Amino acid sequence: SPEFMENFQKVEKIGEGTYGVVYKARNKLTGEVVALKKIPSTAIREISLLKELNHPNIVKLLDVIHTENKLYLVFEFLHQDLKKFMDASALTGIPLPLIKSYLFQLLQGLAFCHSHRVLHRDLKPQNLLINTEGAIKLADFGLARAFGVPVRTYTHEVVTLWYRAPEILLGCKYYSTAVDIWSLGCIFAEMVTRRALFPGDSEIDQLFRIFRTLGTPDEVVWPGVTSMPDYKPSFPKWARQDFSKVVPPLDEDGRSLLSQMLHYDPNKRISAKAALAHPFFQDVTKPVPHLRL
Numbered sequence: 238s239p240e241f242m243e244n245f246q247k248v249e250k251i252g253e254g255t256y257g258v259v260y261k262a263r264n265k266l267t268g269e270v271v272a273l274k275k276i277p278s279t280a281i282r283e284i285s286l287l288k289e290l291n292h293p294n295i296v297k298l299l300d301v302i303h304t305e306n307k308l309y310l311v312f313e314f315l316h317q318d319l320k321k322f323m324d325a326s327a328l329t330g331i332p333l334p335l336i337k338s339y340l341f342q343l344l345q346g347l348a349f350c351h352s353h354r355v356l357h358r359d360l361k362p363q364n365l366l367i368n369t370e371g372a373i374k375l376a377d378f379g380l381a382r383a384f385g386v387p388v389r390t391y392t393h394e395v396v397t398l399w400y401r402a403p404e405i406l407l408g409c410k411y412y413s414t415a416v417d418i419w420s421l422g423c424i425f426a427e428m429v430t431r432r433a434l435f436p437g438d439s440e441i442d443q444l445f446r447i448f449r450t451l452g453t454p455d456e457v458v459w460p461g462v463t464s465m466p467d468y469k470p471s472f473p474k475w476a477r478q479d480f481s482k483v484v485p486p487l488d489e490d491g492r493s494l495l496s497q498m499l500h501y502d503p504n505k506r507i508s509a510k511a512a513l514a515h516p517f518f519q520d521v522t523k524p525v526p527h528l529r530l
Protein backbone atom coordinates (compact mmCIF):
# COMPACT_ATOMS: atom_id res chain seq x y z
CA SER A 238 0.00 0.00 0.00
CA PRO A 239 2.24 2.91 -1.24
CA GLU A 240 1.82 6.29 0.51
CA PHE A 241 0.86 8.00 -2.79
CA MET A 242 -2.56 6.18 -2.62
CA GLU A 243 -3.27 8.75 0.14
CA ASN A 244 -3.99 11.14 -2.80
CA PHE A 245 -7.16 9.05 -3.54
CA GLN A 246 -10.43 8.35 -1.64
CA LYS A 247 -12.23 5.28 -3.13
CA VAL A 248 -9.60 2.94 -4.65
CA GLU A 249 -11.77 0.06 -5.79
CA LYS A 250 -10.62 -2.87 -8.09
CA ILE A 251 -12.66 -2.74 -11.36
CA GLY A 252 -10.69 -5.11 -13.59
CA GLU A 253 -7.61 -7.18 -14.55
CA GLY A 254 -5.55 -5.62 -17.33
CA THR A 255 -2.77 -6.96 -19.56
CA TYR A 256 -0.11 -5.65 -17.11
CA GLY A 257 -1.76 -5.47 -13.63
CA VAL A 258 -4.84 -4.66 -11.67
CA VAL A 259 -7.06 -1.74 -12.77
CA TYR A 260 -8.72 0.38 -10.04
CA LYS A 261 -11.34 3.11 -10.04
CA ALA A 262 -10.15 5.92 -7.79
CA ARG A 263 -11.16 9.47 -6.80
CA ASN A 264 -8.49 12.18 -6.30
CA LYS A 265 -9.26 13.85 -2.82
CA LEU A 266 -7.99 17.41 -3.83
CA THR A 267 -9.42 17.64 -7.43
CA GLY A 268 -12.36 15.22 -7.01
CA GLU A 269 -11.63 13.54 -10.41
CA VAL A 270 -12.55 9.82 -10.86
CA VAL A 271 -9.77 8.01 -12.75
CA ALA A 272 -8.65 4.58 -13.82
CA LEU A 273 -5.43 3.57 -11.95
CA LYS A 274 -3.42 0.77 -13.69
CA LYS A 275 -0.64 -1.06 -11.86
CA ILE A 276 2.13 -2.24 -14.27
CA PRO A 277 13.02 0.01 -16.20
CA SER A 278 14.35 3.35 -17.62
CA THR A 279 13.60 3.01 -21.40
CA ALA A 280 9.90 2.07 -20.48
CA ILE A 281 9.64 5.25 -18.28
CA ARG A 282 10.87 7.51 -21.13
CA GLU A 283 8.58 5.76 -23.73
CA ILE A 284 5.45 5.93 -21.45
CA SER A 285 6.02 9.55 -20.26
CA LEU A 286 5.98 10.83 -23.86
CA LEU A 287 2.42 9.48 -24.26
CA LYS A 288 1.14 12.19 -21.79
CA GLU A 289 1.37 14.58 -24.81
CA LEU A 290 -0.64 12.32 -27.24
CA ASN A 291 -4.13 13.83 -26.68
CA HIS A 292 -7.16 13.35 -28.90
CA PRO A 293 -10.94 13.00 -28.28
CA ASN A 294 -10.89 9.32 -29.36
CA ILE A 295 -7.86 8.34 -27.24
CA VAL A 296 -8.25 7.58 -23.49
CA LYS A 297 -6.18 10.37 -21.88
CA LEU A 298 -2.97 9.37 -19.92
CA LEU A 299 -3.09 11.83 -16.99
CA ASP A 300 0.04 10.75 -15.02
CA VAL A 301 2.91 8.22 -14.62
CA ILE A 302 3.78 7.29 -11.03
CA HIS A 303 7.14 5.37 -10.38
CA THR A 304 7.48 4.50 -6.63
CA GLU A 305 8.95 1.64 -4.51
CA ASN A 306 10.18 0.00 -7.78
CA LYS A 307 6.47 -0.20 -8.84
CA LEU A 308 4.73 1.67 -11.78
CA TYR A 309 1.18 3.13 -11.97
CA LEU A 310 -0.61 4.83 -14.87
CA VAL A 311 -3.48 7.22 -14.24
CA PHE A 312 -6.00 7.43 -17.05
CA GLU A 313 -9.31 9.19 -17.73
CA PHE A 314 -12.21 6.93 -16.62
CA LEU A 315 -14.98 5.63 -18.90
CA HIS A 316 -17.86 3.44 -17.68
CA GLN A 317 -18.16 0.68 -20.32
CA ASP A 318 -16.11 -1.20 -22.96
CA LEU A 319 -17.19 -2.39 -26.39
CA LYS A 320 -16.94 -6.06 -25.39
CA LYS A 321 -19.57 -5.64 -22.66
CA PHE A 322 -21.72 -3.43 -25.01
CA MET A 323 -21.49 -6.09 -27.76
CA ASP A 324 -22.59 -8.80 -25.22
CA ALA A 325 -25.44 -6.45 -24.00
CA SER A 326 -26.51 -5.81 -27.70
CA ALA A 327 -26.42 -9.53 -28.84
CA LEU A 328 -30.20 -10.28 -29.28
CA THR A 329 -30.69 -7.44 -31.83
CA GLY A 330 -27.07 -6.34 -32.65
CA ILE A 331 -25.56 -2.80 -32.58
CA PRO A 332 -27.50 -0.63 -35.15
CA LEU A 333 -25.48 -0.02 -38.40
CA PRO A 334 -25.48 3.80 -37.86
CA LEU A 335 -23.81 3.30 -34.46
CA ILE A 336 -21.32 0.71 -35.84
CA LYS A 337 -20.49 3.29 -38.51
CA SER A 338 -20.09 6.11 -35.96
CA TYR A 339 -17.88 3.86 -33.76
CA LEU A 340 -15.65 2.83 -36.71
CA PHE A 341 -15.36 6.43 -37.96
CA GLN A 342 -14.29 7.64 -34.48
CA LEU A 343 -11.81 4.80 -33.94
CA LEU A 344 -10.24 5.55 -37.39
CA GLN A 345 -9.85 9.20 -36.24
CA GLY A 346 -8.00 8.03 -33.12
CA LEU A 347 -5.77 5.73 -35.19
CA ALA A 348 -5.08 8.47 -37.75
CA PHE A 349 -3.98 10.81 -34.90
CA CYS A 350 -1.72 8.29 -33.14
CA HIS A 351 -0.22 7.00 -36.44
CA SER A 352 0.51 10.61 -37.54
CA HIS A 353 2.61 10.92 -34.29
CA ARG A 354 4.45 7.59 -34.93
CA VAL A 355 2.59 5.72 -32.13
CA LEU A 356 1.08 2.26 -32.53
CA HIS A 357 -1.38 0.37 -30.41
CA ARG A 358 -0.51 -3.19 -31.52
CA ASP A 359 -3.07 -4.86 -29.21
CA LEU A 360 -6.45 -3.44 -30.19
CA LYS A 361 -9.40 -5.52 -28.99
CA PRO A 362 -12.99 -4.85 -27.92
CA GLN A 363 -11.98 -4.75 -24.21
CA ASN A 364 -9.75 -1.66 -24.82
CA LEU A 365 -12.33 0.31 -26.71
CA LEU A 366 -14.24 2.39 -24.15
CA ILE A 367 -17.60 4.10 -24.68
CA ASN A 368 -19.60 6.86 -22.89
CA THR A 369 -23.16 7.94 -22.82
CA GLU A 370 -22.66 10.80 -25.34
CA GLY A 371 -21.94 8.34 -28.33
CA ALA A 372 -18.12 8.62 -28.13
CA ILE A 373 -15.69 5.70 -28.29
CA LYS A 374 -12.03 5.88 -27.30
CA LEU A 375 -8.99 3.65 -27.64
CA ALA A 376 -7.31 2.67 -24.39
CA ASP A 377 -3.64 1.55 -23.90
CA PHE A 378 -2.10 3.11 -27.09
CA GLY A 379 1.70 3.06 -26.98
CA LEU A 380 2.00 0.61 -24.10
CA ALA A 381 3.14 -2.30 -26.32
CA ARG A 382 6.24 -0.31 -27.50
CA ALA A 383 6.98 0.57 -23.81
CA PHE A 384 6.41 -2.88 -22.16
CA GLY A 385 5.80 -5.62 -24.83
CA VAL A 386 2.64 -7.75 -25.38
CA PRO A 387 2.99 -10.92 -23.29
CA VAL A 388 1.57 -14.41 -24.02
CA ARG A 389 -0.26 -14.47 -20.63
CA THR A 390 -1.36 -11.55 -18.38
CA TYR A 391 -0.17 -11.04 -14.77
CA THR A 392 -3.22 -13.31 -13.77
CA HIS A 393 -2.07 -16.02 -16.31
CA GLU A 394 -5.07 -15.14 -18.59
CA VAL A 395 -4.35 -15.79 -22.29
CA VAL A 396 -3.81 -12.59 -24.26
CA THR A 397 -6.19 -12.91 -27.23
CA LEU A 398 -4.73 -13.57 -30.76
CA TRP A 399 -8.07 -12.92 -32.48
CA TYR A 400 -7.18 -9.42 -33.69
CA ARG A 401 -3.53 -10.04 -34.53
CA ALA A 402 -2.28 -9.12 -38.01
CA PRO A 403 -0.81 -11.87 -40.23
CA GLU A 404 2.59 -10.19 -40.52
CA ILE A 405 2.94 -10.43 -36.72
CA LEU A 406 1.97 -14.11 -36.75
CA LEU A 407 4.44 -14.79 -39.67
CA GLY A 408 7.37 -13.32 -37.70
CA CYS A 409 7.87 -9.89 -39.30
CA LYS A 410 10.22 -7.91 -37.03
CA TYR A 411 9.31 -4.38 -38.33
CA TYR A 412 5.53 -4.36 -38.58
CA SER A 413 3.93 -0.91 -38.23
CA THR A 414 0.70 1.09 -38.32
CA ALA A 415 -1.08 -1.38 -40.67
CA VAL A 416 -1.33 -3.85 -37.78
CA ASP A 417 -3.86 -1.56 -36.10
CA ILE A 418 -5.98 -1.30 -39.26
CA TRP A 419 -6.14 -5.10 -39.41
CA SER A 420 -7.31 -5.31 -35.79
CA LEU A 421 -9.93 -2.63 -36.31
CA GLY A 422 -11.20 -4.49 -39.43
CA CYS A 423 -11.62 -7.63 -37.38
CA ILE A 424 -13.56 -5.56 -34.74
CA PHE A 425 -15.74 -3.99 -37.44
CA ALA A 426 -16.70 -7.47 -38.70
CA GLU A 427 -17.51 -8.65 -35.14
CA MET A 428 -19.79 -5.65 -34.54
CA VAL A 429 -21.70 -6.43 -37.76
CA THR A 430 -22.01 -10.23 -37.40
CA ARG A 431 -22.07 -10.51 -33.60
CA ARG A 432 -19.34 -13.19 -33.71
CA ALA A 433 -15.52 -12.92 -33.70
CA LEU A 434 -14.15 -13.06 -37.25
CA PHE A 435 -11.00 -15.16 -36.51
CA PRO A 436 -11.27 -16.70 -32.97
CA GLY A 437 -7.97 -18.58 -32.98
CA ASP A 438 -6.79 -20.41 -29.91
CA SER A 439 -3.10 -20.76 -30.91
CA GLU A 440 -0.85 -19.00 -33.35
CA ILE A 441 -1.30 -21.68 -36.07
CA ASP A 442 -5.04 -21.84 -35.54
CA GLN A 443 -5.21 -18.06 -35.82
CA LEU A 444 -3.17 -18.10 -39.08
CA PHE A 445 -5.23 -21.01 -40.56
CA ARG A 446 -8.48 -19.26 -39.56
CA ILE A 447 -7.36 -16.17 -41.54
CA PHE A 448 -6.21 -18.41 -44.50
CA ARG A 449 -9.56 -20.28 -44.69
CA THR A 450 -11.50 -16.99 -45.06
CA LEU A 451 -9.09 -14.80 -47.07
CA GLY A 452 -7.18 -17.57 -48.95
CA THR A 453 -3.70 -18.81 -48.16
CA PRO A 454 -1.43 -15.90 -49.03
CA ASP A 455 1.07 -16.26 -51.87
CA GLU A 456 3.54 -14.15 -53.76
CA VAL A 457 0.76 -12.85 -56.10
CA VAL A 458 -1.28 -11.15 -53.27
CA TRP A 459 1.67 -10.58 -50.90
CA PRO A 460 5.06 -10.18 -52.53
CA GLY A 461 7.75 -11.40 -50.09
CA VAL A 462 5.37 -13.48 -47.90
CA THR A 463 7.16 -16.81 -48.71
CA SER A 464 10.40 -15.37 -47.22
CA MET A 465 8.86 -14.42 -43.85
CA PRO A 466 10.49 -16.09 -40.80
CA ASP A 467 7.53 -18.30 -39.82
CA TYR A 468 6.12 -18.96 -43.33
CA LYS A 469 6.16 -22.66 -44.24
CA PRO A 470 5.69 -23.98 -47.76
CA SER A 471 3.68 -26.83 -46.20
CA PHE A 472 0.84 -24.49 -45.09
CA PRO A 473 -2.43 -25.81 -46.69
CA LYS A 474 -3.69 -23.82 -49.71
CA TRP A 475 -7.26 -22.56 -49.07
CA ALA A 476 -9.31 -20.60 -51.59
CA ARG A 477 -10.55 -17.10 -50.60
CA GLN A 478 -14.27 -16.64 -49.67
CA ASP A 479 -16.59 -13.77 -50.75
CA PHE A 480 -17.15 -11.08 -48.08
CA SER A 481 -20.85 -11.37 -48.94
CA LYS A 482 -20.66 -14.71 -47.06
CA VAL A 483 -18.30 -13.50 -44.35
CA VAL A 484 -20.10 -10.32 -43.07
CA PRO A 485 -23.75 -10.39 -44.13
CA PRO A 486 -25.75 -8.09 -44.06
CA LEU A 487 -23.09 -5.44 -44.60
CA ASP A 488 -23.58 -3.42 -47.84
CA GLU A 489 -21.08 -3.11 -50.66
CA ASP A 490 -19.70 0.16 -49.25
CA GLY A 491 -18.81 -1.56 -45.92
CA ARG A 492 -17.60 -4.78 -47.58
CA SER A 493 -15.27 -2.72 -49.86
CA LEU A 494 -13.77 -0.87 -46.83
CA LEU A 495 -13.45 -4.10 -44.79
CA SER A 496 -11.63 -5.82 -47.71
CA GLN A 497 -9.15 -2.91 -47.83
CA MET A 498 -8.58 -3.14 -44.03
CA LEU A 499 -7.90 -6.87 -44.32
CA HIS A 500 -5.46 -6.83 -47.29
CA TYR A 501 -2.64 -9.25 -46.63
CA ASP A 502 0.16 -6.97 -47.84
CA PRO A 503 0.61 -4.35 -45.10
CA ASN A 504 1.68 -1.77 -47.77
CA LYS A 505 -1.53 -2.27 -49.66
CA ARG A 506 -3.75 -2.21 -46.52
CA ILE A 507 -5.70 1.03 -46.32
CA SER A 508 -4.41 3.76 -43.93
CA ALA A 509 -6.65 5.25 -41.23
CA LYS A 510 -6.46 8.64 -43.00
CA ALA A 511 -7.59 7.09 -46.36
CA ALA A 512 -10.30 4.98 -44.67
CA LEU A 513 -11.88 8.20 -43.27
CA ALA A 514 -12.45 9.30 -46.96
CA HIS A 515 -14.15 5.99 -47.92
CA PRO A 516 -17.70 6.21 -49.36
CA PHE A 517 -18.95 4.07 -46.46
CA PHE A 518 -18.71 7.27 -44.28
CA GLN A 519 -20.64 9.57 -46.66
CA ASP A 520 -23.78 9.32 -44.42
CA VAL A 521 -22.03 8.98 -41.02
CA THR A 522 -23.86 10.37 -37.97
CA LYS A 523 -23.27 10.27 -34.20
CA PRO A 524 -26.18 8.35 -32.57
CA VAL A 525 -26.54 8.02 -28.76
CA PRO A 526 -26.28 4.35 -27.50
CA HIS A 527 -28.68 3.02 -24.85
CA LEU A 528 -26.29 2.49 -21.90
CA ARG A 529 -27.25 0.99 -18.53
CA LEU A 530 -24.53 1.85 -15.95
Ligand SMILES: Nc1cc(Br)ccn1
Nearest residue numbers: 358381382410411412
Ligand atom coordinates in the same frame (compact mmCIF):
# COMPACT_ATOMS: atom_id res chain seq x y z
N1 LIG B 1 7.66 -3.82 -34.93
C1 LIG B 1 7.50 -3.74 -33.57
C2 LIG B 1 6.48 -2.98 -32.97
C3 LIG B 1 6.41 -2.95 -31.58
BR1 LIG B 1 5.05 -1.96 -30.71
C4 LIG B 1 7.29 -3.66 -30.80
C5 LIG B 1 8.27 -4.39 -31.42
N2 LIG B 1 8.41 -4.42 -32.77
